[PDB]
Each structure stands twice: as C-alpha cells, then as structure tokens.
Design a protein around this nucleic acid. Structure first.
Ligand code: XG4
Ligand code: MN
Ligand code: MN
Length: 430
DNA sequence: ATAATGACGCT
DNA sequence: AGCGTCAT
C-alpha cells in the first residue's frame, strides 16, 4: 500500500563500450573502421581464439570463443587484429589504458563503479536532483535524447527502426509529469539526458562509442544496456518491468546466468523472470537460501538494492596464462621460467599502479591448475608481497606451490600444470 | 585447446 | 585461509 517500497529511490546507469577491444584497434588502425573484424590472441593454434568481434562480423555469425580459422569460414573478408605479446603471453595494456580514459570522463559526471574493463555503473541520483532545480520547470525536449529508447513504447492505437524510437520517445515525453520533482519517471528521463551528455563526451574525447542502460538499480540498467546495443541507450522504468519480465528468460538477469539460475528453472518449473512473482519470499528462501530468496523475491518486481560502490580502480591486479594439452608445464624449470615471466609483467603493472594511484599491494596469491582437474583454479596459495621485485615474487610463488609436485624426480613436475596465475592484492594507502 | 582477468560469497 | 560461483 503506502508502505510498499517500490525500488524507485535511485537513478542508476550502466555504460558499456561497444565491441571494446575492436574499437581500440580501429581507432589505432583506420583501415579496420567499419569493416568486419575481430581481436585475437595467439595466431598459432587455429589462427587464435577470438575475444572481441565487431558488429559487422557478428552479422555473419562470428562470436567470441571461436577459432579465427573457423570465423574466416563464416566471413572470408574478416580482418583480424592480434593482441600485443610480451614475455610469451598476451598483454592487455592497450585496453587497460583505453579503459582508464573512459573511466576518467565518466568520473566527471558522477561517482562510478568500475564493473569490468569496458563498463561502469553510475549513480546519478544527486546529479538528477541538481539538474531538476536548474531546470526550474521547463519541459524536456526530445532533442535532449537523440539516442534514447523507451522500453515498452510505443504502445496502443512507422515501419523502420528509428521511426519507432521517436514515436516511443514522443509518447513518453507527452506523458511526462513535469511539475513533480518526485515522480520517479521524470528522474529517469533526467538521468537519461545526463547519460546522453556523458556518452557524447566519451565519443568526443576518445572516439569510442558505447551503450548505456538507465533504470532504478544495477540489475535493470545492465539488462537495459543490452536492449539496443550498439551506440544507443535505453530507459527502463519501474512500470515497464511486468511486460519486460513476462518473457525475459531467467538466465539473462545478472547473476542468474549460471547454476543458481538453472536451479530456479528446474526446481520451480518456470522459464521467464515474471513467473517468480507467484512465490512467497519464504518459499524462495527455502529453495535457494535466505539471501537469494530475498533477492529473487524483490528482483522479479524490478526491485534491487545493491549499491553503486565508489570504486574506480581494481581491487586486485592479476596475470595468468593457460597451458592446454601437450603444452602443459611438466618440468620444474619450465614452471620457474613462466612464474618469472608472469612476475615480470606483474611488476611493471604494480610499479605503474603505485605511482598513478599511490597504493601498494601487500599480498601475493598463487593459483594453479593441474592437468586432469576440472575447475578454474585447482589450488590457491598466498605469501607476502614486500618488494616489487619480480625475481622475489617468482621465487616466493614457487616456494609455496613446490610441495605440490607429486613427481618422484626433482627435475620433472607432475601432474602437468595447465594454468599459472599470479595476483597482487590487499592494497594499502602508500 | 578460446584465453585473460576480476568481484564476491561460503565456510 | 582456501575454495566455489559468476562474470567480461
Ligand atoms: N580475454 C578475454 N577477454 C574477454 C572475454 N570476454 C570479454 N572480453 C574482453 C574483450 C571485450 O571487448 C571486452 C568487453 O567485453 P563485453 O562488454 O562483454 N563485449 P564487447 O564490449 O566486446 O561487445 P559488446 O558491444 O557486446 O559489449 O572484454 C573473455 O572471455 N576473454
Ligand atoms: Mn562492451
Ligand atoms: Mn562489458
């Protein structure tokens, strides 16, 4: 009734770059602009695995996870860009540095939560209240929202894609309660005006294009972000959630794409997000635990309370390489060498981190995977990070895993390692 | 035999 | 402390 919290207290946006690693290479090499192209790591095996696909190549069916030699079967004119290699491994420095350019522009508008290398969450609540008071009381022109989609509109009593957008935008704006600085739909509209400005600044200042989702919480803005990619932004209001969730497959919601989402489907016998509304919170707490139960119950009414954390820098700095198949490390010296290669790149990035952000990692986590195991990591161990010295980090990382060699021979290493991963963490103000 | 990372929950 | 999940 009057005491049902509708999850409309905040304005939150999710900006995510369109085919990010591809845009970075396309800005650098103009010959790849507006062409089907992909980014690839390691051209030896089947031409390398594809990690990012432009939208022109997606049109032919090229996806990430594909081998470049298979993607050229689907698209013969596919242009490839290969990631820098340093010390025998992929090096993502170019994209990290591109990512920092974008984070700094978004930071100028609001406090952001770096959520990946190519996306950040924005909490625009206060900026919305600020803009609402300098607007005095003026209506909101559709000229302020040249790339916004209003999810669920048009509705009621034009055949092309941009025609629909306008007529949906017009309908929304025609309906807008301009008088009421408290109406949550007006605030989203104003959030969306700010996000247009911020997306323009990103494109003006980096040449990168991105999509954005604007809703009342992180989960809805993330889902909204995907609805009109690329180069568009989508407003999802509280009232569009019922129709939106009635055919929304469960797995498309953040944190439900895995086994939890699969057990919601199998146990509860449903397919779509909107179907969860029939269960009581207690029922959902019984099947999925108190925390998930409560979260599911509020979520399927479009209510979510996870806050935008004020974090623009990563909490961990990490460095890993896989060794699949016959290339799995099988001798002690081979393990030592790569641990040193990984420690060396970690050292350049730590030293850069300490001068740019004046903090220092204090703990070093070593994780490995053995051949024949099944999980991502097979063993995690940890020691102290006192000096930014690769040889010490290499030595210490080896020390705390060497007892895992079931090899009777000192020279050999079994079982063969298929993943080495080093991660500096527990950062303190420096 | 896509890889390379990063955040966070559970016990 | 060390493992498990979910993610881009
Ligand atoms: N190495 C590696 N990189 C990945 C992986 N997944 C993503 N990346 C890297 C490369 C990706 O470019 C970058 C951004 O990831 P997204 O936002 O999920 N997809 P993008 O921005 O490319 O397309 P869209 O327009 O659909 O958002 O993360 C992966 O599994 N492995
Ligand atoms: Mn992206
Ligand atoms: Mn992303």
């Amino acid at each position: 009734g009057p005491h049902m919290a509708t999850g409309q207290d905040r304005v939150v946006a999710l900006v995510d770059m369109d085919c990010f690693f591809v845009q970075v290479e396309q800005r650098q090499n103009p010959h790849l602009r507006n062409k089907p192209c992909a980014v690839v790591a390691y051209k030896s095996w089947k031409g390398g695995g594809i990690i990012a696909v432009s939208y022109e190549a997606r049109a032919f069916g090229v996806t990430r996870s594909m081998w470049a030699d298979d993607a050229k079967k689907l698209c013969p004119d596919l242009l490839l860009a290969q990631v820098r290699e340093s010390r025998g491994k992929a090096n993502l420095t170019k994209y990290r540095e591109a990512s920092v350019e974008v984070m700094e522009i978004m930071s100028r508008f609001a406090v952001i939560e770096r959520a990946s290398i190519d996306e950040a969450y924005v909490d625009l609540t206060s900026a919305v209240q600020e803009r609402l008071q300098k607007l005095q009381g003026q209506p909101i022109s559709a000229d302020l929202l040249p790339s916004t989609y209003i999810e669920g509109l048009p509705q009621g009593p034009t055949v092309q894609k941009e025609g629909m957008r306008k007529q949906g935008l017009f309908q929304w704006l025609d309906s807008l309660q301009i008088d009421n600085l408290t109406s949550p739909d007006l605030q989203l509209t104003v959030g969306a005006v700010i996000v247009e400005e911020m997306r323009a600044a990103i494109e003006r200042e980096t040449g990168f294009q991105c999509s954005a989702g604007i809703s009342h919480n992180k989960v809805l803005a993330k889902l909204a972000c995907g609805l009109n990619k690329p180069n568009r932004q989508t407003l999802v209001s509280h009232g569009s959630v019922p129709q939106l969730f009635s055919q929304m497959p469960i797995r498309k919601i953040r944190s439900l794409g895995g086994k939890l989402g699969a057990s919601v489907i199998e146990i509860l016998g449903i397919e779509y997000m909107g179907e969860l509304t029939q269960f009581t919170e207690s029922q959902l707490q019984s099947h999925f635990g108190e925390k998930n139960g409560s979260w599911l119950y509020a979520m399927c009414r479009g209510i979510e309370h996870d806050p935008v954390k004020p974090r623009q820098l990563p909490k961990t700095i990490g460095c890993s390489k896989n060794f699949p198949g016959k290339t799995a490390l099988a001798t002690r010296e081979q393990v030592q060498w790569w641990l040193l290669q990984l420690a060396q790149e970690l050292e350049e990035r730590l030293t850069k981190d300490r001068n740019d952000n004046d903090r220092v990692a204090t703990q070093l986590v070593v994780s490995i995977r053995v051949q024949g195991d099944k999980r991502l990591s097979s063993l995690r161990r940890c020691c102290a990070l006192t000096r930014y010295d690769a040889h010490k980090m290499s030595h210490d990382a080896f020390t705390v895993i060497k007892n895992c060699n079931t090899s009777g021979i000192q020279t050999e290493w079994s079982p063969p390692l298929t993943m080495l991963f080093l991660c500096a963490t527990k950062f303190s103000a420096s």
